[model samples]
Target: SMNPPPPETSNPNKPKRQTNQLQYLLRVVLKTLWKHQFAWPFQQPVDAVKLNLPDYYKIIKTPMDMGTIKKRLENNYYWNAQECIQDFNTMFTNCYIYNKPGDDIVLMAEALEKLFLQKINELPTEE
Candidate 1:
C-alpha cells in the first residue's frame, strides 16, 4: 500500500480535519491499518488475534483466514464518510497529524508501505 497522494493533490485523509477526528496517533494507526486492508500484511491474509487488543480480546468468535492477499483496488481512490471520520478520530486521539506536504511526504508514504511489507516478511511461513 503505497502512500496515497496529498489532500491538496487529491489524496485521502485530507480536507481539513475535525477536532473530534483525531485524539491519538497510534489509535489512528490501528484504525488506518485495520479499516482498509491496504497497509495490512497483504502478501498474505491476516489473522485476527483479538487477544492482542484488550476490549476485543476473547470476544472474537472466529478466526481470520491466513493466506489472503490484497490484489484488487477500490473503484474510488478515497474512503467513504464513515471511514474518514473513524480515521480522523483515531488520528486525533493518537496525535497523528501531518504538517508538510511535498516530496518528503511522498518519501514517508513509501517508507510506510515498505515497512508494512517488511512486517509481512516476519510472519510465520508454512511449507
Candidate 2:
C-alpha cells in the first residue's frame, strides 16, 4: 500500500506578517483622521479656480490631501510608515503656508497634526 504525505504548513510568525500589522494600523489611523469633523478641509484637493485662489498652486507646489493619501494607501504607494507620515506632514505644512497663523483652516490643520502624531506614537517600533 502507498503512503500519503502530510500537508505542508507555513510559519505563522513570519516577518511579512509584521508588515501587514503595520499596514492595518496605518489604515485604522487614516480612517480616524478621515472621520474627524475638522477633516473636511483636508479631505479633498483644494480647488484653486473654484475657491478663487489662483496663487494656491504657486504657493503649494506639491499639494497633499487626505483623499490622495487614502488612494495612495490603497494602491500600495507607501513602502513604509515614514513615507505615509511625510505626506501627512506635507498636507499640514501646505495649510500653514497658504493660510494665516490664526486662520480657522490653520487651526484645523494644527489639531489634525497633533492627532496624527499621537496616533503614530502608538504604533509599534519597526524592526
Candidate 3:
C-alpha cells in the first residue's frame, strides 16, 4: 500500500549521521568561533580539560550544525552576544577558578572584555 509505506520506518540519524560527544564538541566550538568572527587561538591552545576544567568547553563546543550555528549567531546578534559573554564569564569565574589574588586572569578577562564589554576588562562583579 502506497509504495510499501517507505520501509515502515526510517532512521534519520543513523551511524553515518551520528557524531560522538567529542566530535560534536569539536564541530560546534569551531563553528561558533567562526560564526562570531572570533579567530581560533593563534598560539598553542591547550584542550579545555588540560587547562583546568571542561564544562565551558563542553558548553561552547556543543552539537550544532556549523551552517546553522553560523547563520543563527550572525542573524541573532543580541542573543549571540549574550551567549559569548555568558560563556566567558562562566569559564573564568567558575570553571577556571581564578578568583584568588595575584593571578593574571586579566588576560582571559581582557580577551573577553575586548570582544564583548569593550570598556573595562575587569568584570563589574569582581569582588
Candidate 4:
C-alpha cells in the first residue's frame, strides 16, 4: 500500500514567524532616515547594520523567504508585539523631531507612517 505524505508540522516554540516583518520594518526606517540625511554617521545599509545600529540584532539576524517576506509585509507583521516596542519608539521619536511640513496637515504624516509601520512590525502573528 502506498503511504500518504507526512503532514506538515509547526514548532510551537519556534521563536516567532513574523521576524521578516520586523526586518522589513527596520529596513524602511533605516532607509527613511538615510533619505532625510538623518543617518549622518552611517552612510549605507551595511554601515547602518554593522556600525550605527550595532545592537539592532533584527537587521543582522532575521532571515526570510520571498513568499514569507511578501506575506509578512502584507499582514500584521509579527508573532508578538512586546518584542519590538523599543525599536518602534526609537524610530518614531526621531521621525517626529525631524518632521517636514507641507501644504496640508502633513508635517508629521511621515512620522506617523513610520510609527504605524513600526507598530505593525510589532503586532503578534498569532495573538
lDDT, each prediction: 0.30, 0.73, 0.34, 0.39
Q: Which model scores highest in TM-score?
A: 2
**TM-score of each predicted structure versus truth:** 0.20, 0.80, 0.28, 0.26
> Between prediction 3 and prediction 4, which has the larger TM-score?
3
Q: Model 4 misses residue 22 by how many Å?
A: 1.3
Query: What is the overall TM-score of model 4 with all chains considered together?
Result: 0.26
Candidate 3: which stretches are off by over 4 Å? Answer: 1-80, 119-127
lDDT for each residue of candidate 3 in 28-48, tens digit (9 for 90 to 100): 443334435323331122244
Which sections of candidate 2 miss by over 4 Å?
A: 1-18
Stretches of candidate 4 exceeding 4 Å from the true structure: 1-18, 41-82, 88-127
Task: Look at candidate 4 and give me any clashing residue pairs.
Answer: 78-125, 79-125
Q: Could you give the candidate ranking by TM-score, starting with the highest?
A: 2, 3, 4, 1
2 against 3, candidate with superior TM-score = 2
Runs in model 1 lying further than 4 Å from the true structure: 1-102
Best candidate according to lDDT: 2
Candidate with more favorable, higher lDDT: 3 or 4: 4
lDDT of 4 by residue, 64-126 (tens): 122232233335344543434443344344333333445221344354455556556554454
Scored by lDDT, model 2 comes in at: 0.73
